Symmetry: C4
Subunit: 388 residues, 4 copies
């Protein structure tokens, strides 16, 4: 087996087609299913896997109470084949309240963070064994992507942040070979706050669209040079911005370089990718809450500041339904690299108070060069039918 290089052109897509749905919450009402959040998808050269951070409990279980909280020692990284719900036979791959995983063509890398808020540990597990670890450098919630890392020619890269959630933080980009950290680069460029990067291979480098939790409702961009380890960063050009919260479309802005200072505080993990001058992106339908999910192409959204002409919109989850995090993953085809995305469908607290837990299901779409119709694929559970 050979290392992945991702050295094919990006598939020319017309939009996205339905790929997977796990129905986790509906099933939790009649079966033993893990409580999770922060899911993502990543594929080895043959097949795709779904990941999520468990809460060390199933849903119909008194331990599900108060699982809205982000970090406990019992959170572990769950990994199943895509479409297999997180049942009790699910393997816990490592201890983690923040994680990233990727396959370099030969084996899986998992980056797993756990421990005290002020002094966390990131473990690097490769081909089923612990190879390296690093401790918190800013003593303030060391944290990473919550989606797939990217490997080119045996070197994988992952973005990690330590420091304030609402101010200048310390972001670093790690380069990892067979689980061993070989280089660490500081963030450089004009992005002012970076969290939860959704990264994809863009040979010969890697590109990430992230979350600015401080001053921007426009999404930061991080560009990683795999050859000399140099880093650059900026903001997505599109005037149709990707974060939540954000201003409405008529009053949102981005200049490609700075956070827009428009309802910039807080945010949600999301994604986007460039195609020439244009941009494919997803976002919540609601500008204030994690409700609904839509994708579209912005004409000039990559190259033209404040561009707002969109086309090829698709509703993924209608605005009467809860969404959550979303992220990108890439899949190598015969002659091109396709882009896919997942969206987290969060149920329970804080939005739905009949129950005491917080969990999620997922829905997954992949780029297509063919044609498609319309629909909406929400979580689908009836909150009144759930164990509280």
């Amino acid at each position: 087996v050979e290392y992945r290089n991702w050295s094919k052109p990006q598939c020319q897509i017309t939009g996205f087609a339905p790929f997977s749905k796990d129905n986790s919450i509906r099933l939790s009402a009649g079966g033993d299913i893990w409580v999770t959040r922060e899911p993502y998808v990543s594929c080895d050269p043959g097949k795709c896997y779904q990941f999520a951070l468990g809460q060390g409990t199933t849903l119909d279980n008194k331990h599900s109470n108060d699982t809205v909280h982000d970090r406990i020692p019992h959170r572990t990284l769950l990994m199943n084949e895509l479409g297999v719900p997180f049942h009790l036979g699910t393997r816990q791959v490592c201890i983690a309240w923040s994680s990233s995983s990727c396959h370099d063509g030969k084996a899986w890398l998992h980056v797993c963070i756990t421990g005290d808020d002020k002094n966390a540990t990131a473990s690097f597990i490769y081909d089923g064994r612990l190879v390296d670890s690093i401790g918190s450098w800013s003593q303030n919630i060391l944290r990473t992507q919550e989606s797939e890392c990217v490997c080119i020619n045996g070197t994988c890269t992952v973005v990690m942040t330590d420091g304030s959630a609402s101010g200048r933080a310390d972001t670093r980009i790690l380069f990892i070979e067979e689980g061993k950290i070989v280089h660490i680069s500081p963030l450089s460029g004009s992005a002012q706050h970076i969290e939860e990067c959704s990264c994809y291979p863009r040979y010969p480098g890697v590109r990430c669209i992230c979350r600015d939790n401080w001053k921007g409702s426009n999404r930061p961009v991080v560009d990683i040079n795999m050859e000399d380890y140099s880093i650059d960063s900026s903001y997505v050009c599109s005037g149709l911005v990707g974060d939540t919260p954000r201003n409405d479309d008529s009053s949102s802005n981005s200049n490609c370089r700075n956070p827009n200072n428009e309802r910039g505080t807080q945010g949600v993990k999301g994604w986007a990718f460039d195609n020439g001058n244009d941009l494919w992106m997803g976002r919540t339908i609601s500008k204030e809450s994690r409700s609904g999910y839509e994708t579209f192409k912005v004409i000039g959204g990559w190259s033209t500041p404040n561009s707002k002409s969109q086309v090829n919109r698709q509703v993924i989850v209608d605005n009467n339904n809860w969404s959550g995090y979303s992220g990108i993953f890439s899949v190598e085809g015969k002659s091109c690299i396709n882009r896919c995305f997942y969206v987290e469908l969060i149920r329970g607290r804080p939005q739905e108070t009949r129950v005491w837990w917080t969990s999620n299901s997922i829905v997954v779409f992949c780029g297509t060069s063919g044609t498609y119709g319309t629909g909406s694929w929400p979580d689908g559970a009836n909150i009144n039918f759930m164990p509280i």
Copy 2:
């Protein structure tokens, strides 16, 4: 591994022998089992798999209420080794309220349809990745076989329909290579309505026996030429007709060419196959409801219009028990290709109203050249023992 060509003669059979039974509904009364309908079977070169469309819920689960409905966003294609019940570790292969699957000798193809009735999307997944998609062409419930597609020399074919369920519709035959649609041929010939084809390899081509939901209780036949993509169609000759509803045997007719206009509206998915001038077929025992199931050979049933001489009858499910959809699948043996079939055993609504759900189990038989006895192999659940 090589592409399948199915280039062996058809096995000479004397009837069918018991092969598999999953007992899904009996088990659902004491375990967490998926609610499903529209099951089918298909084998890779090594082993057989059972498929079905989940309802995004288990049976003992409040979400099982009102699962009689055909199309919701939460339906997904389930896939297990044949004989493994749909428990919570079952993989959901794609999002689908209509589907077909087949293995070309190298990898699995799944065709999965979901979304809005008037604007559905068909996804084509090959070797674990989304390769193509197509949108609705008549804006009226794009739909496909609900049984295995057939591949010869790396080209797979699947029959799809869009348009009226009770009038002229738009049926097309897709040719697919490694997940990519390479050609689409319109239906041609004298079949006037085509749904839910049960197809089998008949080298060098493919033959399908389908459901006419409009004017015929005789089953349409679709012949597919894999070399030039040409299509022909007609109706099964046998005067013992295969649809439900239908006239009783003394007053049923087929002329091989036209729908018989005998209780033609509505129908059920079924199968038949030719052996020279003769026909092997199955059908429900009841002529008006999906109750019981029988198989038999009709002498001259392939070649002689209105032939009604049967022999080698076998009861599969006695008429005091519910059946449902049925379909064919083919299995390559050492020197010949065998024909097998499955029967969907529907329990719950609308026929049994003590419970609020609709689900099924399955029973499976394979052609034999040996001898056999008699029996009946129904679902076997006691409706009074079930969670409602």
Copy 3:
């Protein structure tokens, strides 16, 4: 992979050592576990599997009521790796209320009998496909070994009986190559009634120790010549007889040739094997009921009529606990063939009437050339703790 020839000498054993226990009934009180009976064990060249006839239901399930009955259409052959309890993910390999399975070194053969008492069907499934079938020849409960068949050089043999349970019956020995019946030999010799043979390879032939349900509490022997298909039969010489019911040790007899007419009617499946002039055998401890289980070597038990000197006794299940069927299986070692056995531990009806079901667990022992101690390994469930 090559066909098995079993052409190594038999292991010299000093007794048996603990190998496996599944604890099915204890687990059934807190988990979804199949109701089964008539288990057995068989190994491919790499690993062992446990088999049993399911009753189409789990134990904590209203359908478990009245599972004391032997034959219903919902019984299927279950197959797991040895030591994996029959949970809901268990594969049902075929439809069967009587079965036998074996691996020829290349693939599995399953012989599965189901259908009407007076007209049953045996299906032969090889390498995952139905290859042959045969119908009842005496119209009276066609039935087979309920333990492993034996294959030498690609030809597998299995013993089947059709006819009276309490009088002359029609026993036949089938020879099967890759699932295809190639020859059928009538029983010959002096055994007067043959059921439920426990067979083992004894190169160049196969030897079976069976159950006489008519006139003998001494066990019949069937010898199968794999080269010319000839059959011989007689009775185990040992004066310590293996069936239940039977006379006490002081008044039991066997002459090697005829049924002993000592509490001969009824019986239980059991096993024995020869070592030179001596005999290793197991049996219930109770002479009248399926209670307890013991193994020992009878000096001259193979060659000397009415021999009663035993040595190397081991209690497997003490007499205060229920047992049931037992059978032999053989395992190829580096330089010899080992013999192992399982015993079925029956719980519920008819002996324990607090509950309405009948099920079993298993315990498994293997021949050893080493040393060992003592113990008792019964089912271990508390009938008062069970769902009724």
Copy 4:
């Protein structure tokens, strides 16, 4: 596949990083999970597995009552991939109330002890078959490591004891090749009582840190020469002793040679390993009970009698939480052999009497040459939420 030689240098470590956690008890409150104790971890050349002794029952099950007891016939060795909780699909590998397992590079060896206290049997299972067995030599609870054995060049060694738990006993070191005992060496050296050895490869030999249940709160050391089968033994030099119970640090002693006679009776399974003159070790935080868990390096802890200079302490489980047994396992990396350890987290009786059962979960850490922070990773179940 080749035999393991473990012929690489030991990894230089700075401490330990989080590796795995199974959350067994939390999950048991909402799912069917095995009752277990005496867990351990061992890896084949590709991946790691978790083992434990089941109690033949799930936790939410009336049979979980009184599972504090050490030895019943229903205990079996469970084996899952590391991180997969012991659900109902878990394989029971053999019958055992004491065990050890290891992989020699080609196949798994399991050593399984069961039966009567005064006459137990040890079974040796290699590559899925029973190869050897040995009976009790002192008629007083034959028992072994409860952690991984170690194989070099096709010879596996395991430490077994028979005799008094509180006085002179009979300890022997077995040498095993493909499951067959080829040599047995008596314990030699100055260790006066040996139980539950935690062994690791230290090419060309094997080293074990054990439990003295009689006179020492310092841990015995056993050195095994794999070339001539010679044995040596002594006690860990460190004045910071590893057993529980023990004296406080100010008044604890070890002279490297004799048991210290400081709260020597009783004990708990634990581990340590050498790095030059220094010692890495773990122990409960409490000196009297199985509460808390800490690791640290003792400068001169291997070579300097009574050394008490520690550095690089890490809390693994804070002292407000229950621990239990702990043990070492070794993982071969690209250029070195790493050392890892697991901690058993015991819940229920005798410490927590709200419930009537005794079970455990596990947490697992691996050596790292990188950096790390702080935390505590206890079982995490709320005893008040548990089925009693």
